[PDB]
């Protein structure tokens, strides 16, 4: 009884025309309704975006730090996000951990930020490849989680997503670390919450392994990446059709 | 002689709403045409400003990434920054270096990516509280040059800018124009006379109406790079610091 989840991270990608085909191809397809779509474009163009996204597809930042205003060069705030028109932002990003540094405790402190200033999020994990390699998949996945549900009261507001940041995997793989992952939430938060949060696999997601990893049981949807920028993302949405 | 430069580094604040205010202001006052003024906004509100802003303030990018494209989520590149309006990106600020360390070698090539993308940039040097009393506020300061140096070819698109990181977390005119004094001269030496002769340095440490004046007097001081004061109706009054 979850609701398919599907996000696309555009990353570090986009300009005013290719972001504008983007959105076109978005609001001109015939996407499944059934499903909760999400796009994260860069911060320069979340107004932009807003204007030409149909109202199936909500608006995330791909960051965002801890507080609504401060000294701290760089950094844009929730406040500015939900003025920009956005509702979702991505936190704790392999990306944002590995190459920027970002620890668990700041990723703690900005989902918590983020939840109180009424924006959703979409809180990200996943091990390094030296992790797998030392049977520490786990230790990781639930450090991190525990991290991040710490800092969530409503779960109704969050969506976790899986990176296999170690592979730079299979549908089984991603399947029984989705399922550990479900399971932590049930033994320490509660059954009711590891019941209806929906857990993304972040892995390399394309138009043709989407309906296969769709079908998993504890695979609530995707964080989309490259494939989010072209048609191909259309058919990604359509996944459980 | 120097062209007067005054940057105003909005950091983390802003609104549709104060964001128009400041544009409004700045569209209103009566600014000394001499000085360049820059102002760096949150990357949300590029667009937004450039079209509210007067012709006579340039804007400026808080911090970007070293590649065009990729898959660096939530960072900005120099190209999306143009595509917004945007001449200018502040690159090595303190907050940068210290909260988010952002390190020399990485700096560098911003610099690098951002000059070569056409983008205009004001560089940010200074020193720790644990340096300078230590005696090696040179000894940072020059290494952090030497990183930007390195990666600028063409002076005429650069600002430097000082930053007394070891107060900002009280500095006198005399202190500030001693270190821009040797920054100069490392300049003269390192890189040429030329170069040392025309590149305007900013100060970037705690700049209001009430010491612009005489900071801007010293023979060093080619401006400033002013944080929250770029905020409020003194931000007029600071750009026009030379102003008879």
Redo the contacts between chains.
């Keep these: 009884a979850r609701r398919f989840c599907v996000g696309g ?1 555009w ?6 025309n290719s972001i504008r085909d983007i959105c076109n191809t978005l609001k001109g397809a015939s996407l499944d309704p059934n499903v909760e779509v999400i796009v ?1 474009c ?7 975006c807003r204007s030409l996204l149909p109202p199936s597809v909500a608006l995330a930042a ?2 965002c ?1 801890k ?1 609504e ?9 929730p ?3 939900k ?2 028109g956005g509702q979702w932002v ?1 936190l704790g ?1 392999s ?2 951990r590995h ?3 970002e620890d668990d405790v700041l990723i703690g402190e900005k989902i918590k930020h983020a939840l109180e200033s009424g924006l959703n999020v979409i809180a990200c994990i996943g091990e390094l490849l030296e992790d797998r390699e030392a049977g520490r998949t786990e230790e990781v996945c639930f450090r991190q989680i525990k991290h991040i549900a710490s800092n969530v009261k409503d779960w109704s507001k969050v969506v976790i997503a899986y990176e296999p940041v170690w592979a730079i995997a299979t549908p089984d793989q991603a399947q029984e670390v989705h399922s550990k992952v479900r399971n932590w939430l049930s033994t320490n938060v509660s059954a009711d919450v590891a019941s209806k949060v929906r857990i993304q696999y972040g892995g390399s997601v394309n138009a043709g392994n989407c309906k296969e990893l769709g079908r998993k049981p504890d695979i609530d949807g995707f964080l989309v ?2 494939a989010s920028l072209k048609p191909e993302f259309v058919q990604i949405i359509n996944a459980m059709q």
Excluded: W
């Design positions: 991270n990353k570090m990608h986009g300009s005013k994260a860069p911060a320069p163009y979340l107004d932009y791909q960051n730090y507080v205003q401060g000294a701290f060069t760089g950094e844009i705030s406040g500015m996000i003025d920009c991505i990003h990306e944002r190459v920027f540094k990446g490259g």
